[PDB]
Design a protein around this nucleic acid. Sequence first.
RNA 1: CCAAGAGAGUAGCACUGUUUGGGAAUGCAGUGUCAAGCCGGCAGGUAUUUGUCUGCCAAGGUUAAAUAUAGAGUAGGAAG
RNA 2: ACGGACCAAGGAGUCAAACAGACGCGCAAGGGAGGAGUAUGUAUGUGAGAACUCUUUUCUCGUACUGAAAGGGAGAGUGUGAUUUUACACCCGUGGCGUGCGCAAUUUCUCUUUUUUGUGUUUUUGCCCAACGCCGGCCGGCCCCCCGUGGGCUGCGCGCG
RNA 3: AGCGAUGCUGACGUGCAAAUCGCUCGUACGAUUUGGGUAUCGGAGCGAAAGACUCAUCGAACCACCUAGUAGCUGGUUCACGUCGAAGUUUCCCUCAGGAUAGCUGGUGCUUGUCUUUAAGAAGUAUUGUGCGGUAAAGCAAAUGAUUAGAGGCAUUGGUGUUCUUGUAAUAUCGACCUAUUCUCAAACUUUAAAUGUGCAAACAACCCAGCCUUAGUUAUUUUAACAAGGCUUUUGGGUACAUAAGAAUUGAGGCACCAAGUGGGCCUUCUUCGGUAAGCGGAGCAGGCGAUGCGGAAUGAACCGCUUAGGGAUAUGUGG
RNA 4: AAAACAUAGGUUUGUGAUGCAUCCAAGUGGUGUAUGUCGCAAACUGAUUUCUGCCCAGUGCUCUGAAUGUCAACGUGAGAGAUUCACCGACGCGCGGGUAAACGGCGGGAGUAACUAUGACUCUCUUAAGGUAGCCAAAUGCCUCGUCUUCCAAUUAGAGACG
RNA 5: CUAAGCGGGGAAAGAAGACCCUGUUGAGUUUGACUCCAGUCUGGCUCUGUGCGGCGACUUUGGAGGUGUAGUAUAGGUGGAA
RNA 6: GGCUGGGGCGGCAUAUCUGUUACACGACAACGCAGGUGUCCUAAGGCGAGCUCAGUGGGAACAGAAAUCUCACGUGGAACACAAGCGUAAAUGCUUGCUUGAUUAACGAUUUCCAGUACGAAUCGAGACUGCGAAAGCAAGGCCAGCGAUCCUUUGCGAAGAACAGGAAAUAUGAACAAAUCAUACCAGAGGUGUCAGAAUAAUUACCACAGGGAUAACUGGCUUGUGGCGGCCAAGCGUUCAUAGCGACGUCGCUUUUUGAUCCUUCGAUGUCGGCUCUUCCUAACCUAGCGCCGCAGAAGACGCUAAGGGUUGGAUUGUUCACC
RNA 7: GGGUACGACCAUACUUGGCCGAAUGCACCAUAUCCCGUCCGAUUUGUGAAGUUAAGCGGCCACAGGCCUCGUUAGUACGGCGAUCAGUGAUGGCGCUGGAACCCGGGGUGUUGUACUCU
RNA 8: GCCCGGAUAGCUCAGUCGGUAGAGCAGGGGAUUGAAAAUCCCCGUGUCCUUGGUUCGAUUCCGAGUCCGGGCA
Lengths: 158, 105
Amino acid sequence: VHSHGYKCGTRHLFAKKFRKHGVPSVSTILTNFKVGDYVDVVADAAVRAGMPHKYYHGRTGIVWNVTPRGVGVIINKPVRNRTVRKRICVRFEHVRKSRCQEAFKQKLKDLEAFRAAKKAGTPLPPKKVSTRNGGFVCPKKVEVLARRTADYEAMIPY
Amino acid sequence: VNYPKKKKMHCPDERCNAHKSFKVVQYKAGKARLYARGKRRYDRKQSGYGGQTKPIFHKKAKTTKKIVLKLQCSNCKSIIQNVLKRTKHFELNDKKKTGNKDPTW
RNA sequence: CCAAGAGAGUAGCACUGUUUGGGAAUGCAGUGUCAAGCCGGCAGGUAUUUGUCUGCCAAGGUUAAAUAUAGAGUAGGAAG
RNA sequence: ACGGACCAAGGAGUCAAACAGACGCGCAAGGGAGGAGUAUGUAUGUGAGAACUCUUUUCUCGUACUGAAAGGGAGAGUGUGAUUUUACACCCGUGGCGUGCGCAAUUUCUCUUUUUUGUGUUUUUGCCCAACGCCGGCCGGCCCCCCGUGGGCUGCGCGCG
RNA sequence: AGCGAUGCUGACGUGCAAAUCGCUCGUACGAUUUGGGUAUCGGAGCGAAAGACUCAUCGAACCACCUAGUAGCUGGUUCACGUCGAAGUUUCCCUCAGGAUAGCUGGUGCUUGUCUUUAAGAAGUAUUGUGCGGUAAAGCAAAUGAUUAGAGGCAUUGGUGUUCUUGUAAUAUCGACCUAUUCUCAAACUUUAAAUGUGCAAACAACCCAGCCUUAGUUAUUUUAACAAGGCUUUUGGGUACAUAAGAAUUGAGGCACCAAGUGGGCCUUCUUCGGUAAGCGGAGCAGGCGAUGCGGAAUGAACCGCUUAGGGAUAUGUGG
RNA sequence: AAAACAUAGGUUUGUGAUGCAUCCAAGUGGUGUAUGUCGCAAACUGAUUUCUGCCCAGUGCUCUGAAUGUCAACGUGAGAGAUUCACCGACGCGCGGGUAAACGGCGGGAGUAACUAUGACUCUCUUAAGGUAGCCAAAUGCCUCGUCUUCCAAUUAGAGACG
RNA sequence: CUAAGCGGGGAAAGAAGACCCUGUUGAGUUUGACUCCAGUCUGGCUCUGUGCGGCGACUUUGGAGGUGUAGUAUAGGUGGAA
RNA sequence: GGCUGGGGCGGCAUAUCUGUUACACGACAACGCAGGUGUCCUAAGGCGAGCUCAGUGGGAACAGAAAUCUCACGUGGAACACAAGCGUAAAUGCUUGCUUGAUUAACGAUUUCCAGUACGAAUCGAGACUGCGAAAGCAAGGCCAGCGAUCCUUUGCGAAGAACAGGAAAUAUGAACAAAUCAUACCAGAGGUGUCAGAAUAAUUACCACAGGGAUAACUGGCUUGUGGCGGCCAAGCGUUCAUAGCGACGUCGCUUUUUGAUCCUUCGAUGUCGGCUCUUCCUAACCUAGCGCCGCAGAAGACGCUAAGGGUUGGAUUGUUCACC
RNA sequence: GGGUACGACCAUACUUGGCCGAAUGCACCAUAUCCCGUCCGAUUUGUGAAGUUAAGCGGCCACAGGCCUCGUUAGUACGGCGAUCAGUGAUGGCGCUGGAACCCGGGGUGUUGUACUCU
RNA sequence: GCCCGGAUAGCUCAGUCGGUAGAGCAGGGGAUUGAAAAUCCCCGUGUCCUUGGUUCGAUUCCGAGUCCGGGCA
């Protein structure tokens, strides 16, 4: 059985990788928040505080909190027969807003905007096509296949 | 190690909350008492005609013991304890480190 | 014309042990030690001094009835 | 692998505290006596552990909790004024839910019935949630320190018996 | 004679026998036999000592008693049908044949309730949308780490040599070194990098519009600040709904809970994979079994094939012929 | 049933009675011992014979040894009191000394012949002391059927050597 | 279907393996185990007199009872002290 | 004690840290692989500023390869108290400068391991009070290992004030009351457990006891077949000539199981241990016998092979033997 | 469009070499009294004037280097799927699903905000 | 845990009824001894471990963490 640091390491994961070294950007810091955001978790390294244990990068949870430097994310962690919500104390630097949800809503409103426009706003306005289908065809030059060995002396392994 | 001896540090005391000068010192123990309640009791079991009735403990497993500093902020009638890491070496004498730019050899 | 006639090597204390739920001691037993102006003596569950205040008055002496019977009790019923 | 030649008769999950649930069962903030004791004939008996009880005194547990304590202690009603020490009033704390109740549309039905539709609304004791609020508790806050507008951590507590 | 017991591993070995018997034998005037009398006794004795022997009792004698003494263990452990139905696993232990605990289980529930599901809530799943790694793969001319040859230079005597003394000479010279080349390679190498997986998201408790309420939120200036932030908002206050035009399916309920068992040695397998030659070996990972089921198939089989089971009937298939 | 014990034979202690040894609940209890070192007690060794080395560091024992370390009560004097402390302070122990027919123990290191092998010879570390006398493949030797001599046709046997 | 045999098998019988392991199961025995104890010793105290005699303890007059250098000078030194 | 391919032993896989195993989430065993931990450090803490490495070249008395000096390069290849791993470069490094935040808390809130206990260890605020700085800011001792229940002891915790009647509305008790000790408290610390959730513990038993366990060794039997034991293949060489009469190196596959190991299936409420005697029968990888092939077989003799298990197959000595061996 | 400046993004923005540059400006560049700071005005501090675009800077260039980027490779490889099937054994095997890295080719070579300026 | 010798020179040890720094002895020269043997004279040298203390002056005189060696718990 194995050794256990709460920050017990790995091979090639935590290490800060391919030209991706160094501090978080100021863009990172310019960000802005509100709570309830569904944001995803990543690990810089940078400061080895506010830094989750292993579970958590690549997972999406929801923020419940914004503290000075940091934000609270409750995440559902799967134990036995359940997922428990865990509320984790990160400083802001280790988390980011997805698109996961964004689209859904985005579309939903956009669509509504259109659906609404379409009735009950002014205009009227084509989008898409159906799915997939049949068709007339006037092709104009079919081929076939003849494979391997003819002129194999030109090619193949030795 | 070595650490200070006197020390400007916080005293919250009622002769103020502030960072103040303290004398620093390192504890030793006010150990046990005859007539102490425990002792009275210990003694009670110990009485009579039996053999010996306790755990005597013989594991030792390290050697460290949390050093405690006893800090007396002057004004303050306040003494405080403040605990250190497990150590094999210690010292308070307010001397300082020096930086090594000269090896005699 | 006033008296005013109440238990000692015991009480106690140490010590030891044993013993107690009883705790810085519930007793007892041994051993040693060993009390009373009597403004006293005893008790008042944290050691003490110290003081009040509170309750009694030991250490000789006898005493139905209501209880027991518990395994092996004896005369004479009642039973399941 | 063990045990197991045969047949009768034996031959092994009991009584029982506090206690948790479940369920019936009683009554209900009381309930349970409870120990006892009385008590008068059916008539052996009798003035019935066991009959009937029957019960003043109550006893006992229960019908606020919190603090080691010292100790305090719940409509901090609601509402209200409120500069709410107070002082007033006196038939739901705040929100989320709610079988429900209401309304309209909805079918037929005379009307009824009223199918069906469409909604409304309503105490968080209907349940739970979610937030104060509340008792004891603790830090006493705010602030340089301390006090008041007011704090601000905490608990087997309290929130319409 | 006697007293004893050496050999036959004699006899017997359910014997005449709880130690017999035959022969055989030790010794047999002495530390010699024995009778009776007398004494030592259990954690004691005794003991020419074997821990002998001590009344078929003896590395603690025997009686009665405490006692039905104690058991993480052996064994047993006494009617029917129905209904539901496991675990070999979780943590800690002076803990490994055991608990506790959790989990699995049964039972008991409790609030609703899906046929309007484009506004039930759910789903061991897809879809999108939306997140995400360093296995497999690649690769070494990229680094890291490894490895083979030449070719092309520099040389600051690597070695060689001639012409030169000899040259920090020349010139040959072969090496070192340089360099680009070049082979072959990695579990704790690695750019890139899979597949296979892994998070999330997909509705009404929603969207907007107003205009509100409130804030010892933002070193403050509100204020017709901004933002923040939340609270609101009769008949939405007021508005506003699931089309695409294009992209699920399900959903023989969901919500929710009470509480007690029985279990903790497993074993078998496709797949991955470790140890070691190996092993029907050991040792893990996934799923499934078996276990704890039989039926049908594999002349034979716990786990292979097929398939699971009310009781039947009739039919046709399964695997297999 | 012997290679065992007993056993005479060997050797040492302990010990002279208000004792030693020793039994015991206790007592004016017991026994050795109705007795006294030609005595008793206690252990070891195991005819005769012959001899019995070295070590006392260790570990015991022993000591009349030392004397001022230590070592309990015990006392003793010291604060409102409790209460505290100090000094006092015993054998023992430290300590010092003895001791091996007490327990037991009793080395390792090099070199060295010009023929030869061989290494007497000589140097080393080191122990309490470093195993003497003796005696062996011996009930003792692991290597091991060690070796040789010897006996047998042929001998892991024997024996004799060797040791 | 057997008599007399017979001893391969019936993993015969034969005896809840004594070996072996385990067991928060034992003992007999051992020992510088842990932890006591019989025991042995020592001290302390005591029974406990009787003497005559030493040391202690008492505080009583304060006596024997106090010189560095340099102050030819008295040196713990204190103080009413001119 | 346990541990454990039996026990023992050894080892520590027992609390543990790391990296790796381990399937690109997550989780995963071995007495696997490769490593660590019991401390260290008043700065090696903390903060600023400054400064930049590992490394390479070129010069520069002494000085040469290696002193310094200096230019000049140079993505850290260093360096960062330490095992290991992470990170990382106008810094995190490194040097300097300054300091005490390694501080103090209502200390809630938070995470990890996880029983969704725990500790341990971490994370996030708020209050202090400091530090540092120009300032934002940072700063609660690099980050990750390096550490400890109940139980007990101990250390630390208001003086100061204002009382009428509590004057923050003034820290608790010690139960008949006083005043004073003494003692108890509340609370937060330290004091220790490495068998690391945390019992005060030596032998010996072949005199032995007991309960079980084939959940476990010690026989057979069972898998395997390393190990042994047997054959090829191959064929470098050998073998006067000579690859192959006969061989057979180097290789390199076979094959077997009268070896030996490994494994523990079974067996412990029983499967009678050695050897040997006897006695049978069987097997063939045929020693002898029948008969063939080759010969580096002239004869001679042997050798090699086939076909062949029908047949045959010893006495002693010594040695328990076995084996050994004359 | 450039410049300037603040950027943001953080390599098509990069090493390397040429060529060229109007403006505004940057820049180099002088100085060191003051302040300031340094062994040192190199840095920095303080002053800022003479020079000078040489450098920088800029822009471009470049069988440049690098990157960037696509294609190519290759449904191979490599996974997923199977009761099935061949296979000494790995394997290999089908059909059902997915899916490379390198290579070479090809092309590409900073983007663009804010404030300021400069006809 | 109390009891304590040792903390000084190479090793080992002191300071008028208030002054302050020791020998030994390794050592290092001499000298002695023809050179030796035997012997003599001279070298050197400490925080008086480690730190505190009375006072015009104080290792004199003093306090103490410590260190360290030993005895019973």
